[PDB]
Amino acid sequence: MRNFPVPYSNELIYSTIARAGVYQGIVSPKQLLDEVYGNRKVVATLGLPSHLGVIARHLHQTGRYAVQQLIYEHTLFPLYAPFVGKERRDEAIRLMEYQAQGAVHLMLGVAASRVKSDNRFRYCPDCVALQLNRYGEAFWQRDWYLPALPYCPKHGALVFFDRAVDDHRHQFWALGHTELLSDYPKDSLSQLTALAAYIAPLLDAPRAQELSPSLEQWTLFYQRLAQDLGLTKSKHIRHDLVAERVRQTFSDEALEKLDLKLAENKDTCWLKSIFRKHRKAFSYLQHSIVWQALLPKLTVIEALQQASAL
Amino acid sequence: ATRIQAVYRDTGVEAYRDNPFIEALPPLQESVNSAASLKSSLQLTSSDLQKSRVIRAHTICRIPDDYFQPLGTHLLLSERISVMIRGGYVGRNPKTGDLQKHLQNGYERVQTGELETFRFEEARSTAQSLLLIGCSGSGKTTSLHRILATYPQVIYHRELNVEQVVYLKIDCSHNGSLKEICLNFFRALDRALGSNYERRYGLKRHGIETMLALMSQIANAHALGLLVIDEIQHLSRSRSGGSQEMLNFFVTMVNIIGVPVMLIGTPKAREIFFGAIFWDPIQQTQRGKPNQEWIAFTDNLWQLQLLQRKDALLSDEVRDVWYELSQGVMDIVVKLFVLAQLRALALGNERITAGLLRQVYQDELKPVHPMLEALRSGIPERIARYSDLVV
Amino acid sequence: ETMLALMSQIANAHALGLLVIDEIQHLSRSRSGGSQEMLNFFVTMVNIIGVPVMLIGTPKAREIFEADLRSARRGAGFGAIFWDPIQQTQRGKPNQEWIAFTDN
Amino acid sequence: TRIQAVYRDTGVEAYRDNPFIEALPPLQESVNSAASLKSSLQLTSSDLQKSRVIRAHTICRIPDDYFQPLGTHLLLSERISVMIRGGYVGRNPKTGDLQKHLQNGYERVQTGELETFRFEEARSTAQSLLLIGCSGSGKTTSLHRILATYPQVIYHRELNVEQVVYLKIDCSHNGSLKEICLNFFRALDRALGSNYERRYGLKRHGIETMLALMSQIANAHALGLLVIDEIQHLSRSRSGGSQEMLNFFVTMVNIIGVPVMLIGTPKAREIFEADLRSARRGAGFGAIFWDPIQQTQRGKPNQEWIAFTDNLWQLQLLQRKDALLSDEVRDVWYELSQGVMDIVVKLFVLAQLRALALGNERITAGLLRQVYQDELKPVHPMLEALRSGIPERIARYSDLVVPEIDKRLIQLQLDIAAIQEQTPEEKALQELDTEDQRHLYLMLKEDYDSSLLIPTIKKAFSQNPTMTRQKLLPLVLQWLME
Amino acid sequence: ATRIQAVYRDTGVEAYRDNPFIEALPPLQESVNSAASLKSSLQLTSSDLQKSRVIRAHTICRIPDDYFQPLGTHLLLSERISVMIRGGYVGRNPKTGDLQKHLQNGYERVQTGELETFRFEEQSLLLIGCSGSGKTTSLHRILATYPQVIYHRELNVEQVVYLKIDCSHNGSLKEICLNFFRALDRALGSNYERRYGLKRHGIETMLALMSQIANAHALGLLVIDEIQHLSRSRSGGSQEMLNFFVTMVNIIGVPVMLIGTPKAREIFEADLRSARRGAGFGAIFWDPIQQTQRGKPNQEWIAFTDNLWQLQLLQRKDALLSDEVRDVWYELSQGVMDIVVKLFVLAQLRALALGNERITAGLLRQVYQDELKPVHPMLEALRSGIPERIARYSDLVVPEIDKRLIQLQLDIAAIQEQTPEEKALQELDTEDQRHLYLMLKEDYDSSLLIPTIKKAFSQNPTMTRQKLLPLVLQWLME
DNA sequence: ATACTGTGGACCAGAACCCTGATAAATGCAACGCTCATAGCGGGCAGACG
DNA sequence: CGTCTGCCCGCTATGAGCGTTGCATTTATCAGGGTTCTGGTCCACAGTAT
């Protein structure tokens, strides 16, 4: 392609590809894959996109955009980066530049989602108006497409609608103006919005890539915080005090809406596994919930740095 | 195909304050010195006059290709082109988000198929149109090409990724079919750019509305500034019902899409048909005196001689003979002068004269004697006869 | 038009110098469209870049390339060249070229 | 390679006028049928005193140019001759004016003079055979050597037909039910000069379509044998199952004549044995089994093993060679190679190659021992399976061979090449134990004497050990050179 | 066009007897040491170090050109190439009938004529290794012993002993198919491609034309180099990639060698993964110099390092190597021959201008983390030892080396300051008696020495030097 | 000061997907056929002389 | 009143532009064995009531 659009601030590269298709009058998706990439064997994905580097070659004459900038500021990788580890993170960064599509999804154990978790398209009530007033266009923002939280960090809640990624595969779809939120209010829980607002600062941080604790330090961090908070007696979990501490911030219905329902009656649980020695990388939601429930006077960057340093 | 990284300027008009497109253009020259800017002539030098025969004969034939002289209408055309290409960027600002509304609309036109669809109400288009028709043998294909040589055509911006083409020139097909303008446009928009738009948009089995809206959208993906079409006379030879379709599409594009369009055609193209500008061949007498423009043209064409002998001053008899043999048309003056020089060098007389001019015309313009004699006679019936005669 | 546009690409890939057309007289006037069609097609070759052409025909094929100012102008170009039979007596004395050719 | 055809009469009367059999080499009188198979590289006496690189190259070349004909190859050669020159009865082109004969028979059978007559020529009894044996016993080289005696292409001047006597196919590492069909086209387009693979072997056609086109291709010519070798590599997971493989391989009826032969390890023997009909037709007439050679089959040790060991020992090329072979060397060859043909020759080659590397320049039983525990790791399951003798373990572990042994041979040759370089000039430097006197060594003799300066500094240091580098220098001239 | 009149010599091998195309080659007796005779050294006199810094820098920058140390992986390749070329002329013997006629005669004799039997039986190679291991440069100079064109006078046949081809960036099969005739016409001077290589012919026809001219002209070796530069997608899939090479090897019939990277090994995995000695395609691997050999340091490394170490030109250099300076080369370079001598030559130039005129381990880190940037993925892949990363991060060759060389040669000009050593050299008259000064620098201080040598050389007893060296020392000590 | 109970870490085995091969089917795409337009043509009709 | 020789016009022939359509071509669909996922297991061990 000759005139490739430059992505806006906080925009998925998928929406940039879709707007490139919109600008130059390409309707058939096969032509779009022929011109953007050169091959008709590329799967369209939201978050952790593959075949990057080709999208950067069209932006070669703009020296500021490279593989690293696109992979830290226009994808959903920084959310998965600090928690998976160091070697796995670096290998994923080095692999998303090549032609591997399913390898990116399958290498990270945390990212091995298998079946999609409600992969339909979402937007916001007031973000679209702000984008139209500031840009004159609409795009799939990175804030909207949280892996499991259908909640804008600034607004109440998202608004799902029809169509899904698994239904039609090779199509890059971008919202224009012909569809928008019809006037009806959507109920929103304050705790979930607070959690989303707390966790959203992770996608824009200069040190969000270096602050990656190793596999062994996580259990030491958990034991140190439990010792300083004095919950453990002697290498033991109360099974009720930690449950009450979590319940003081998050209720049962909010956790059910997040599929992270507490199972305090049964020995196996995500919190219990966090207490035990870790095996594989855990999702951002579990770590954020544990950190916020067990310490409410700190933010993501300082807590992650404290965990990594010692 | 001169790819330049643009460096921005700061114009004095508040309507043009923050565009990158129209800041990138070179400034509008003052008409006092714009006439001197257009002036070009052969470098001559006196070392040729003492050289061999065929070498000297070769460089005389470069006079019709290297000689240009500005006139009164040249400044008006330059000012009008500058105004019409500066008025076509005030509605497609990409910095403040106005091109992204002129370009989102262009996709629902392709999807639906109709050119009159509109998704954003505030997407306004500011563009102009102008037709330039003058008697054949006036220069309206090289004068335009020399006016549009200041602008470097393709210019590349840095903050954006747009490779803005300043102007584009295409020719109507002799057939006049609907699927030929939308093809030589895609040929002219990848000859000067290095891409392949034709292999995308023309090879496939497409319709006519699809390939009429695709052109109007790809002419806004790049911020095209002026689409000029020459030889518009060809549409009258097209199939039945196809002459008016272009006459509506080239007024819808100016109004809706917003790309300014300039159409140039021969005098025969008044009946088939925005502003109107008419050109006429030069006439030496305005009211009762030989005109300064004609006198200067001849006195400056004089010095482009490589005859071993000559005379200091031109004579009124020779001037009258030249005017009578030319009948005012621009090209025939230069053609007659170069042919007379060629015949003088061939004959062996190193001097030019009126009888020499007459014999050169008579022996070397045999296809041209009928209509030149018609012009010399000046009968209104003979002028109305044939086509594209001055009237 | 498609082949005539491919002509420009072929003539710009290799620096063609002179494209001469001969035996125009051997053209049937009923299998192409008409005299106006012939004229318009042979004027359409102004778009091809450079590549000067030269036209060849019989004096009965001169009638097509006439009566139109632009067509006549492109027909003329560098004047007119008219091959003619060797007349015996241009001057009072018979022409020397006829004598030399006959003797040789 | 189209050889012109010339005919010769044969003793058997069943082929009195058959051209496709008489255009072949004569029937092998089995007195020296496999005697020509015997091959041994020259080993001229002048090659003993030679550079190490060329000798190592000859050592690496030994396995290709050595082929000992055993006593069990005679049966295989006889079988191949029988079912190649016995399957041409139904593909006879020597047919006269049969129109008149058939018309006369039809006229005479209806008028009552004759009451019966045979009118059918569709008489073709296809033959099939398995060759089953442990891997490494030589089921491919000892078949190519036998089948190279028969010309592959013979051209008839009177007709316009060719007899592709043998056509060889090998499966890929993964393998599938379509790769063999494509490989038939690939091999026949290489045997002759044509474009059969692009003309017929198309992607769109189904497996049965190529199997049917095989009939036309192999019946247009007078094809005589179709060897599909190494079916062990066929991936059962990528095939479709352990039953449709049999249902495809017993579908050799629809190709007329064409006696097919299949070779495989006993891992496929259990595959090709599930029912009566497949066991009958896959192995139509017997199934020769190749077993590792033993020291003794009768009370006396087998003489074939002794002859093979002596012939391989005589081929040895070393500066220090022992003519007499001790019986302990034969005992360790048997105890470490258990008669497997591949293992013994590679073991001997690696021992002879390592003898150059270590510089002992002699072959010992112990050297065979450390090369055995050093370079033969992946072939172990064969070794303990044959030592234990359990058929289940042998059948479970009969598909494995040492991988990339050629790269190991190249690495050993490169090591031998790099070892060789020695410098007599460096012998003078080698007595310089002290070091940091190399400073004076380098600075002094570049423009000075280089003959006795190097040795005499050793004497100067030894005689005056309570000293350093600096003031050793000023009197070096007078004490050493003067 | 290097035409040498053919002379005939006796070869001890009975297979090559009476073959006019073979004995024209150089004999085997003097060719044994020929490959080991490619060792080259840019030997210099100690007086050369006394000259200006520009001269020594210009002599040093020629090290990546004139320096060549054969190893154990370089003699074997030469022997293999010699044997492969010499064995490729056993078929085309003009003094003997064609092999088809011999086969027909053998069939006639195994027919009714009385004989037992006849065998109706009828070697491409590839050189794949790590990029920058020294392949093309090694081959260009191991093929120097064989004259390219040998002219026969008894017959009229020009014997092209070997030919060499080279690919270009993003090329296709047609480019090599035409470059073969380009190289052939550069060898002979005829117009073999002015009418035989038109655009009209397809690939099959063009190769059919190749085979007949390769068979009529006596041609022994056809080497195609830098196959890694050939573009895959432009030609198509990897199946016809192998098919074209297979049909090129099969129909021509001459021995053929290919040289490339492991990125072509995945192309040639078929016909090579299964042991096929009849088909050919034997593989020879080149690897970087392994510093550790069976738990011990490699002799080739410590000999190549010693030879490279003796040829350094510096003023106050430490002439002896330490273990750490040798060790850091294998950590910053991994032993590939492309960048070991590059690191040495860049380190010497940086030590010329930066600071003290000696080579240390610290400045090698500056070189590696400042200028030897782009090949970091290859170095990381080599350090990891993973074959996948090594294979898939090849083909990068750190271009624009010539501009770097000329700019480093020019940059040394802007040094107005004088280090005390060379300023003392210049203020001293240049009688080139300073060999003693350079010899005895460490033991005594310059202040005691150079004024004293000025006073002595003002009235030297005799003009002789290095015979009269000790007497100055006796004045020098007291 | 020790046996009993809960617990953390290393660990078999059933199963759910999942890559893959074989087979059947929707389909864009040049590949001809349709139709329109344009210039000539040769036998039939008005016509006029024997 | 026949008929015989020039006109013309409904035809006949052919070029140019566009409209279906046979065709592999590519896509989609279904059976199957394996491999990591995950699930509970258990085995030694830390802390404790007797």
Ligand SMILES: Nc1ncnc2c1ncn2[C@@H]1O[C@H](COP(=O)(O)OP(=O)(O)OP(=O)(O)O)[C@@H](O)[C@H]1O
């Ligand atoms: N004002 C002028 N000064 C100098 N030369 C001129 C002038 N006007 C015309 N000419 C010459 O006359 C010719 C005009 O070019 P051209 O044939 O394209 O003109 P045109 O007849 O107006 O164009 P068109 O092809 O559109 O009918 C050129 O040879 C040009 O040099």
Ligand SMILES: Nc1ncnc2c1ncn2[C@@H]1O[C@H](COP(=O)(O)OP(=O)(O)O)[C@@H](O)[C@H]1O
């Ligand atoms: N009679 C023999 N004499 C010498 N070597 C033999 C003999 N039979 C087999 N070999 C060896 O066996 C090797 C080939 O075995 P191969 O054909 O790969 O076995 P398989 O047929 O099971 O694949 C050759 O290297 C060859 O040296």
Ligand SMILES: Nc1ncnc2c1ncn2[C@@H]1O[C@H](COP(=O)(O)OP(=O)(O)O)[C@@H](O)[C@H]1O
């Ligand atoms: N035997 C050798 N000894 C010393 N330097 C070598 C040797 N072989 C190659 N080199 C060096 O390697 C550098 C690059 O080699 P190059 O010709 O690029 O190899 P390739 O073509 O295989 O990449 C050269 O500058 C050369 O000085």
Ligand SMILES: [Mg+2]
């Ligand atoms: Mg014009």
Ligand SMILES: [Mg+2]
């Ligand atoms: Mg085998």
Ligand SMILES: [Mg+2]
């Ligand atoms: Mg090279």
Ligand SMILES: [Zn+2]
């Ligand atoms: Zn929002």
